[PDB]
């Protein structure tokens, strides 16, 4: 996995690649690593895939209940506090590594969380096996006072670094833009630079090729 987060003028943007692996095998060539905790708070997750999904859903559920209880829009620091205390309690056995970002009444925010329970703050962050390729780009091209379109470019460039240079990362680039005063804008497959070329041959078989021993109609009705 390669995942990043970048702050700009009036908000924050996060991005991720779309490759899912089991060992050296690519299981999913277009999985979605960008998760929704609340409408305007989004998570990017690396590590154990089921752990990132489950921990993002649990805290997302509790955040919704909290928002309804308090009659307030949820804050990023609340999601941050809940995730970190949950992960710490399990002493790293829940392998979730997250970049948390979003906007709320307090402003725009960007954090990261490690499996053992530590949190980080930054203007630019990167997590996952392709984080070193991404961080190299971020350290080279980041500056103070980025615009929206500059931050998207920087974020997706950092993800591309991972896609090309990290074997754990590949396929496409997903992006989510969270700007203050506006709806969060999720850009699924914002970039698709890894389309499979036309195959040389059709492997459609003549009908009857496969030997059959028995046929029978299966009853699905009551």
């Amino acid at each position: 996995t390669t995942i990043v987060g970048v702050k700009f003028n009036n908000g924050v943007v996060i991005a991720a690649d779309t490759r899912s692996t089991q060992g050296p095998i690519v299981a999913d060539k277009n999985c979605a690593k960008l998760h929704r905790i609340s409408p305007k708070i989004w998570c990017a997750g690396a590590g154990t895939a089921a752990d990132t999904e489950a921990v993002t859903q649990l805290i997302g559920s509790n955040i919704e209940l909290h928002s309804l209880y308090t009659s307030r829009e949820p804050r990023v620091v609340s999601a941050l506090q809940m995730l970190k205390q949950h992960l710490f309690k399990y002493q790293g056995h829940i392998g979730a590594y997250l970049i948390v970002a979003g906007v709320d009444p307090t402003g725009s925010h960007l954090f990261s969380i490690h499996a053992h329970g530590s949190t980080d703050v930054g203007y630019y962050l990167s997590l996952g096996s392709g984080s070193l390729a991404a961080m190299a780009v971020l350290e080279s091209h980041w500056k103070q006072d980025l615009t929206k379109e500059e931050a998207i470019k920087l974020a997706s460039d950092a993800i591309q670094a991972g896609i090309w240079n990290d074997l754990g990362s590949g396929s496409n680039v997903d992006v989510c833009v969270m700007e203050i005063g506006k709806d969060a804008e999720y850009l699924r497959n914002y970039l698709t630079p890894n389309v499979r070329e036309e195959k040389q041959k059709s492997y459609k078989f003549p009908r009857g090729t496969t030997a059959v021993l028995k046929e029978s109609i299966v009853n699905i009705c009551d």
């Binding site: 970190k84 205390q85 710490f88 490690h114 053992h116 329970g117 530590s118 980080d120 930054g122 070193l132």
Partner: protein, 196 residues
Amino acid sequence: TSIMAVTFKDGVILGADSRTTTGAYIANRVTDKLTRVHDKIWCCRSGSAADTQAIADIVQYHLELYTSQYGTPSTETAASVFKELCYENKDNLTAGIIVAGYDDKNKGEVYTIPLGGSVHKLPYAIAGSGSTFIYGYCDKNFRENMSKEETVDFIKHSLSQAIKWDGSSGGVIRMVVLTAAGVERLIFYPDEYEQL
């Protein structure tokens, strides 16, 4: 990490580098290891980032609840709460914390809490992997009742050396000044401190 806290005439100053580590990769080069547990009681964190954060969060909660009932806690009280957590959970923790605060009665005070969870009140304290390299320097250069400018220079020079030799230390030198006047945050960049 390299961290320290030093008492002086007008109060106490805390100091720290900004490097966070996962093996030889610097996970964060602009870390804030100086943490507020109360208005004028702060701590320096060394060891596990996750453990020290969870401890500091619990302490901050305890002192906020203390303040609600009994008013401003003493620096000694804050250190006792850190100790209680570190001592009773010694098997499951990797945390070396320095506690520093300003009273008006007691002025500046520094308590250091090593791995085992023991407490030690000192005029100044050094801790973290980089501290090993400055025991000699600090012992030779520390004086009691220094001025603000002198104490800033003492910490700046000390952490400069710790950063120079320890690979686990680096980035910026952050400091937090605790006096009757209030709370002042200082930052010092490589281009200044490296050529001291």
